[PDB]
Ligand binder design. Structure first.
Ligand SMILES: *[C@@H]1O[C@H](CO)[C@@H](O[C@@H]2O[C@H](CO)[C@@H](O[C@@H]3O[C@H](CO[C@H]4O[C@H](CO[C@H]5O[C@H](CO)[C@@H](O)[C@H](O)[C@@H]5O)[C@@H](O)[C@H](O[C@H]5O[C@H](CO)[C@@H](O)[C@H](O)[C@@H]5O)[C@@H]4O)[C@@H](O)[C@H](O[C@H]4O[C@H](CO)[C@@H](O)[C@H](O)[C@@H]4O)[C@@H]3O)[C@H](O)[C@H]2NC(C)=O)[C@H](O)[C@H]1NC(C)=O
Ligand SMILES: *[C@@H]1O[C@H](CO)[C@@H](O[C@@H]2O[C@H](CO)[C@@H](O[C@@H]3O[C@H](CO[C@H]4O[C@H](CO[C@H]5O[C@H](CO)[C@@H](O)[C@H](O)[C@@H]5O)[C@@H](O)[C@H](O[C@H]5O[C@H](CO)[C@@H](O)[C@H](O)[C@@H]5O)[C@@H]4O)[C@@H](O)[C@H](O[C@H]4O[C@H](CO)[C@@H](O)[C@H](O)[C@@H]4O)[C@@H]3O)[C@H](O)[C@H]2NC(C)=O)[C@H](O)[C@H]1NC(C)=O
Ligand SMILES: *[C@@H]1O[C@H](CO)[C@@H](O[C@@H]2O[C@H](CO)[C@@H](O[C@@H]3O[C@H](CO[C@H]4O[C@H](CO[C@H]5O[C@H](CO)[C@@H](O)[C@H](O)[C@@H]5O)[C@@H](O)[C@H](O[C@H]5O[C@H](CO[C@H]6O[C@H](CO)[C@@H](O)[C@H](O)[C@@H]6O)[C@@H](O)[C@H](O)[C@@H]5O)[C@@H]4O)[C@@H](O)[C@H](O)[C@@H]3O)[C@H](O)[C@H]2NC(C)=O)[C@H](O)[C@H]1NC(C)=O
Ligand SMILES: *[C@@H]1O[C@H](CO)[C@@H](O[C@@H]2O[C@H](CO)[C@@H](O[C@@H]3O[C@H](CO[C@H]4O[C@H](CO)[C@@H](O)[C@H](O)[C@@H]4O)[C@@H](O)[C@H](O[C@H]4O[C@H](CO)[C@@H](O)[C@H](O)[C@@H]4O)[C@@H]3O)[C@H](O)[C@H]2NC(C)=O)[C@H](O)[C@H]1NC(C)=O
Ligand SMILES: *[C@@H]1O[C@H](CO)[C@@H](O[C@@H]2O[C@H](CO)[C@@H](O[C@@H]3O[C@H](CO[C@H]4O[C@H](CO[C@H]5O[C@H](CO)[C@@H](O)[C@H](O)[C@@H]5O)[C@@H](O)[C@H](O)[C@@H]4O)[C@@H](O)[C@H](O)[C@@H]3O)[C@H](O)[C@H]2NC(C)=O)[C@H](O)[C@H]1NC(C)=O
Ligand SMILES: *[C@@H]1O[C@H](CO)[C@@H](O[C@@H]2O[C@H](CO)[C@@H](O[C@@H]3O[C@H](CO)[C@@H](O)[C@H](O[C@H]4O[C@H](CO)[C@@H](O)[C@H](O)[C@@H]4O)[C@@H]3O)[C@H](O)[C@H]2NC(C)=O)[C@H](O)[C@H]1NC(C)=O
Ligand SMILES: *[C@@H]1O[C@H](CO)[C@@H](O[C@@H]2O[C@H](CO)[C@@H](O[C@@H]3O[C@H](CO[C@H]4O[C@H](CO)[C@@H](O)[C@H](O)[C@@H]4O)[C@@H](O)[C@H](O)[C@@H]3O)[C@H](O)[C@H]2NC(C)=O)[C@H](O)[C@H]1NC(C)=O
Ligand SMILES: *[C@@H]1O[C@H](CO)[C@@H](O[C@@H]2O[C@H](CO)[C@@H](O[C@@H]3O[C@H](CO[C@H]4O[C@H](CO)[C@@H](O)[C@H](O)[C@@H]4O)[C@@H](O)[C@H](O)[C@@H]3O)[C@H](O)[C@H]2NC(C)=O)[C@H](O)[C@H]1NC(C)=O
Ligand SMILES: *[C@@H]1O[C@H](CO)[C@@H](O[C@@H]2O[C@H](CO)[C@@H](O[C@@H]3O[C@H](CO)[C@@H](O)[C@H](O)[C@@H]3O)[C@H](O)[C@H]2NC(C)=O)[C@H](O)[C@H]1NC(C)=O
Ligand SMILES: *[C@@H]1O[C@H](CO)[C@@H](O)[C@H](O)[C@H]1NC(C)=O
Ligand SMILES: *[C@@H]1O[C@H](CO)[C@@H](O)[C@H](O)[C@H]1NC(C)=O
Ligand SMILES: *[C@@H]1O[C@H](CO)[C@@H](O)[C@H](O)[C@H]1NC(C)=O
Ligand SMILES: *[C@@H]1O[C@H](CO)[C@@H](O)[C@H](O)[C@H]1NC(C)=O
Ligand SMILES: *[C@@H]1O[C@H](CO)[C@@H](O)[C@H](O)[C@H]1NC(C)=O
Lengths: 139, 451, 139, 139, 53
């Protein structure tokens, strides 16, 4: 275990842990609450690099976390979707990918049409599914 | 009927608000010549793809005089200009008694050969060198004439950086997340009102900060016949913006062959004086196609007809009162600042229904502090070599006919009194809005009973 | 379609899409990851306007997204509530509003007591509903 | 009621309200949308203290809200967990704590091993529970 | 004589109570980022490192 501890292991192992990566993603001991505590101008070059790094920290976290909210998966770490898998994406079989490719390799295998999957993802799970209440919310 | 409330995240609604925008432009100056005064060393790159949506069914109301994007523009340029002069050579030692003489009357004289005493690299020793200065930039004091810089009386002085481009390049204004800029796609847009054709582009068009006076350059023009916009017509006092449909071409050039004379005033600092002129002295000029100009001036009086007393007498006079630098078509070109006599363009009057080309006399100033800023003035170093500008003229600025109580006729003379109106000629169609994604609406739908 | 593409269409159409507005709300191509990449002082006037605009970006997103979390609607884009609609708000009928007013007009019709609705919203759906486990969580 | 109105009352009362504290946690009237509106350098000492305070505002909100998301409790304000309570933490009984200690006192009673509880919290409710679909997601 | 710098650029005295001693400065990543360490002892120029941290 550890942060990215299973980065080189098979995809089945990264499926098993996963939180250790998600936990250490927003806040860090490195930030350490700023201030010297314990000259009186904090306009130094260091303060500029820190604050612009604290911004992109939450700017990149919220850019990805906004994606989880529009897919109905905000509350959980792994959610299933109602989008069928299209064979043009990969020809490999069920146990052939989860035990032989590792995630590091997999991100390069879908990076071509990865944005296209994201487009179809907002539709089937939250554009129609959240709409389907119309008939079932009350009759 | 047990109607229940239901929430909707992402509702298309907005309210008029003005936030902070930022810069956008692609590959411009780069390696060969950079250090642009406006684009700095880095602007956020513009996306190659512009996003425009023709908002349907919507009729949002615009206002170009109460719009704050033009005021954000104004205070940005001022703070952008001062940031590009702050780290450079200050010319405080340039305030000494100047003994100057004419040049080759041959007993024609508008520049003076100045000798004066100035500090060198070593603080202990002094040095005497000559330099040429334009008229009005220097003034007498009380046999041998004695002069002084016109700014040493008033505020301080700082030399413009030697390798800085004052050329206006397109700067894009674009909104922050949760905000959007609305574009008036209605060709005819009298003053401001409800615009039927709106778009919500994320980024404006290519806006060039053309520092101009009375007449605008390199601007945007709608397709219909020339547009006339006033905050209030009939308030003789408020100025008048004018958009063309086709721009006129005016080319200007300074025939003087200035040599560069760098003289150090202490360490690292080097004053760039006008050297000795090569070739016969020639006054700077502006060419206007007289054919092209006569029709542009005509289409305006046709559009102005339906806005001022219908069919009556419309005259054009030379500026009218004011100061010498605000009543002439001031602008920057290549680094030297021209001030052209506009009295030759606003003298004709038409009413009741290879090629010759007008030319305009122009003088040059090296001492400047723009936007009526009395804080600190700057010296523009003379540009070594040949000068030639070739920019379209797309806009205009007009003013009063005094206070003629009703009566016989109306006259409009130019008066680019302020700089912010120049950008209003580029921002008449835009306005930013604040998206509010939270909307609540009722429907006969409730979630699970217990949970 | 498109960002705000249905801003002028009836409320029933904005109900149908809606994500296109919600998607392009936090992150933008305009931000474009800052830095020049490809003088050494980034204290320029431009950097000040950008960073203060990136802050209000997530400051306004999180101010509204915090409201969705205290209503039990964080995970989804459209959730139903257990607050009955009070007739003093509008006298119009079910099909009379969704097909004749457009959202742009509607926000002006509730802006007077809109904050009062928000107050009642935290109560019935999350102050009582999340509390109701007391009896049902375990007996 | 009011912000922290039940800070001194028993834990049963803070359980009853609670939102008033959670609501006034991210956004404030104090921030008041900056700008003077209604000299041209905003580099003043005040602007530095404000912006660094607006950052730690959402930096502390998102650091805690990220914890709610990895526990499956993001959408709601009070969620139950599948972690059994270990007697070494407190020897007191069910009605003995909720009616006699107040929260202010309670945070000091668990602050020693509070981080250890958080570790076990990610596991039983989201490391195993979100994984348990493997058998039940489809057979 | 004359100072060699008065010919060229300006001059500014170093502060009297300032230590020019190099002390260890640590470079560390921002959230969502990580620094990878080549733990391979032999590392001719640069190439694929088998031992990463
Ligand atoms: C409204 O808009 C108009 C239109 O944009 C605008 O007018 C422009 O104004 C800018 C300045 O503000 C002008 O740009 C300057 O041009 C100076 C003169 O050189 C120009 O023409 C060169 C012609 O090259 C051709 O012919 C030569 C041989 O004669 C041949 O070698 C070439 O291959 C070519 O066939 C042109 O080359 C040159 O610029 C490019 O190329 C040269 C090298 O060839 C390169 O050095 C340049 O960097 C550039 O890539 C240019 O177009 C020019 O001197 C000046 O500054 C540069 O040169 C000086 C000289 O020392 C350097 O010190 C400095 O560091 C710079 O490198 C600048 O480039 C522009 O020409 C005007 N119009 C045109 C035609 O675009 C108005 O100003 C706007 N309105 C307002 C408000 O004013
Ligand atoms: C590569 O790395 C090496 C190794 O780090 C590095 O070499 C070091 O360089 C730094 C400077 O860059 C040296 O630090 C300076 O030391 C100056 C001389 O004093 C030194 O030795 C003192 C010896 O004290 C012992 O013996 C005395 C009696 O002789 C006894 O009282 C003591 O108790 C002890 O037994 C040592 O004390 C002193 O520093 C500590 O203690 C004194 C008080 O005892 C205290 O005043 C100090 O602040 C400190 O706590 C020091 O180690 C020293 O003068 C200098 O500046 C200080 O003093 C001046 C004098 O006026 C003050 O004006 C100024 O304000 C400072 O207080 C500074 O401390 C260091 O010694 C080198 N190496 C060692 C041994 O560590 C290389 O530079 C690096 N490579 C490069 C790129 O150069
Ligand atoms: C803006 O203002 C600036 C102000 O500085 C202008 O820059 C100035 O421009 C002027 C232009 O006239 C320059 O003057 C030049 O001086 C040089 C150097 O001086 C040597 O020659 C002198 C000759 O006498 C001059 O005047 C007589 C008067 O009749 C003329 O006939 C003659 O042609 C000259 O113009 C010498 O006096 C001087 O003395 C020493 O050498 C002599 C060498 O022999 C000369 O004199 C003898 C007679 O004695 C002649 O027979 C012989 O032909 C020769 O002329 C020697 O005899 C004497 O005893 C001494 O030893 C120098 O040798 C001249 O060469 C140029 O002819 C001219 O006079 C200024 O120098 C220049 N400023 C500076 C920085 O120095 C600037 O031009 C202006 N703006 C513009 C438009 O650019
Ligand atoms: C004074 O006015 C005259 C007359 O307009 C100008 O002469 C024109 O100068 C303009 C720009 O300086 C030229 O305008 C455009 O050139 C385009 C170049 O083609 C493509 O590639 C460039 C670079 O990537 C793109 O920027 C561009 O969009 C194109 O993709 C043409 O393609 C343009 O034509 C048509 O499409 C564009 C796309 O949006 C439209 O915006 C246009 O309205 C148009 O439908 C366009 O022509 C132009 O070629 C010159 N001639 C004419 C007759 O217009 C002077 O330059 C100008 N002087 C100044 C400084 O103001
Ligand atoms: C630059 O800085 C200087 C110094 O601070 C400013 O002052 C003037 O500098 C000029 C030189 O550029 C002086 O003029 C010169 O004076 C020379 C000698 O001066 C002495 O004698 C003068 C009378 O001349 C007699 O003696 C000389 C000796 O050579 C004979 O050649 C003559 O034939 C006469 O017999 C006196 O008036 C003076 O006070 C001295 O006692 C002279 O040789 C040169 O020909 C020339 O005239 C000038 O005197 C300085 N002061 C004044 C009053 O201006 C200077 O203003 C600064 N910048 C400018 C504006 O130039
Ligand atoms: C407004 O425009 C009108 C024209 O529409 C203009 O009236 C004209 O002014 C010009 C210039 O002053 C006059 O031209 C002069 O005519 C006299 C004889 O009447 C000639 O002696 C002059 O010749 C001398 O000057 C010329 C240059 O100006 C030299 O080229 C020449 O060699 C001579 O030295 C000169 O031709 C012209 O007569 C009038 N009238 C008309 C109908 O053209 C009026 O001045 C303009 N007003 C302003 C203030 O712009
Ligand atoms: C651009 O076009 C816009 C659309 O037409 C213009 O807006 C119009 O502006 C006028 C004046 O501000 C508004 O009101 C007008 O009022 C006059 C005065 O009425 C009174 O006096 C007359 C006699 O003088 C008398 O007959 C009346 O009974 C009143 O006692 C009226 O005569 C006009 O008919 C008109 O009502 C318009 O309402 C307004 N139109 C709208 C609603 O858009 C705008 O002024 C133009 N210019 C600019 C720069 O935007
Ligand atoms: C560190 O060690 C690395 C691992 O060995 C080095 O990387 C190797 O670098 C070489 C040169 O850049 C790569 O390619 C070589 O090419 C030569 C030239 O082949 C051609 O000419 C020969 C005759 O001269 C002929 O026989 C061939 O048919 C060709 O026509 C070959 O001779 C070599 O065998 C080899 O192919 C290597 O591919 C590359 N190895 C890899 C893949 O890592 C690196 O250069 C070393 N140095 C540094 C500073 O990193
Ligand atoms: C601005 O200065 C330029 C020269 O630097 C003048 O431009 C030239 O104007 C003449 C007008 O007759 C043009 O002549 C004709 O152009 C047409 C194309 O438009 C061509 O087909 C003919 O064979 C003939 O050349 C000339 O081309 C043009 N040069 C360029 C390249 O623009 C201009 O006239 C000056 N402005 C004013 C006030 O006239
Ligand atoms: C997958 O989608 C692509 C793009 O629409 C399509 O060309 C392809 O036939 C699809 N394959 C199947 C049958 O899933
Ligand atoms: C402009 O007109 C005035 C009279 O109104 C006249 O005195 C003046 O000489 C004219 N010329 C200029 C450019 O001022
Ligand atoms: C003079 O201008 C006119 C109109 O622009 C043009 O048609 C003509 O060609 C120009 N000069 C000549 C005689 O070529
Ligand atoms: C709606 O609420 C207001 C305020 O409490 C109340 O005056 C009104 O009678 C209510 N209407 C009904 C019956 O829903
Ligand atoms: C609680 O956990 C601690 C640490 O694992 C352990 O020592 C203790 O016996 C546990 N108590 C019980 C039985 O819950």
């Amino acid at each position: 275990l550890g942060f990215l501890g299973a980065a080189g292991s098979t995809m089945g192992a990264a499926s098993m842990t996963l939180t250790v990566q998600a936990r250490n993603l927003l806040s860090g001991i490195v930030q350490q609450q700023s201030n010297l505590l314990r000259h009186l101008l904090k306009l130094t070059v260091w303060g500029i690099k820190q604050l612009q790094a604290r911004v992109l920290a939450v700017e990149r976290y919220l850019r990805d976390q906004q994606l989880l909210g529009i897919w109905g998966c905000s509350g959980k770490l792994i959610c299933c979707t109602n989008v069928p898998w299209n064979s043009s994406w990969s020809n490999r079989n069920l146990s052939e990918i989860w035990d032989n490719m590792t995630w590091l390799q997999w991100d390069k295998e879908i990076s071509n049409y990865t944005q296209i999957i994201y487009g179809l993802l907002e539709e089937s799970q939250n554009q129609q599914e959240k709409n389907e209440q119309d008939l079932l919310a009350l009759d | 009927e047990n109607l229940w409330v239901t929430v909707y995240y992402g509702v298309p609604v907005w309210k008029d608000a003005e936030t902070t925008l930022f810069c956008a432009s692609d590959a411009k100056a780069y390696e060969t010549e950079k250090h642009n005064v406006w684009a700095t060393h880095a602007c956020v790159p513009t996306d190659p793809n512009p996003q425009e949506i023709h908002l349907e069914n919507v009729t949002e109301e615009f206002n170009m005089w109460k719009n704050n994007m033009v005021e954000q523009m104004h205070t940005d340029i001022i703070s952008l200009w001062d940031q590009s002069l702050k780290p450079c050579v200050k010319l405080t030692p340039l305030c000494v008694t100047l003994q100057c003489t004419n040049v080759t009357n041959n007993i024609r004289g508008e520049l003076k050969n100045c000798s004066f005493n100035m500090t060198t690299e070593l603080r202990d020793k002094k040095q005497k060198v000559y330099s040429l200065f334009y008229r009005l930039d220097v003034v007498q004091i009380n046999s041998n004439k004695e002069y002084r810089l016109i700014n040493c009386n008033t505020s301080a002085i700082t030399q413009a950086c030697p390798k800085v481009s004052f050329e206006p390049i397109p700067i894009h204004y674009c909104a922050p997340a949760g905000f959007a800029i609305l574009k008036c796609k209605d060709k005819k847009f009298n003053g401001t009102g409800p615009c039927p054709s709106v778009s919500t582009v994320q980024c404006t068009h290519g806006i060039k900060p053309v520092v101009s006076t009375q007449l605008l350059l390199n601007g945007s023009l709608a397709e219909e016949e020339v547009m006339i916009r006033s905050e209030n017509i009939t308030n003789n006092a408020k100025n008048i913006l004018v958009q063309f449909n086709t721009p006129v071409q005016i080319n200007c050039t300074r025939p003087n062959n200035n040599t560069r004379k760098s003289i150090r005033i202490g360490p690292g600092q080097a004053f760039y004086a006008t050297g000795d002129i090569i070739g016969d002295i020639r006054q700077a000029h502006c060419n206007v196609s007289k054919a092209t100009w006569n029709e542009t001036l005509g289409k305006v009086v046709k559009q102005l007809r339906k806005h001022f007393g219908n069919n009556t007498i419309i005259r054009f006079a030379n500026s009218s009162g004011g100061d010498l630098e605000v009543t002439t078509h001031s602008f920057n070109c290549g680094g030297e600042f021209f001030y052209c006599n506009t009295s030759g363009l606003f003298n004709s009057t038409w009413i009741s229904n290879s090629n010759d080309s007008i030319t305009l006399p122009c003088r040059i100033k090296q001492i400047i502090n723009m936007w009526q800023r009395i804080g600190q003035a700057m010296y523009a170093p003379p540009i070594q070599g040949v000068i030639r500008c070739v920019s379209n003229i797309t806009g205009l600025i007009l003013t009063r006919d005094g206070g003629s109580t009703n009566s016989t006729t109306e006259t409009f003379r130019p008066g680019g009194g302020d700089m912010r109106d120049n950008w209003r000629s580029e921002l008449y169609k835009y306005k930013v809005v604040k998206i509010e994604p939270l909307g609540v609406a009722p429907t006969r739908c409730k979630r699970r009973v217990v949970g």
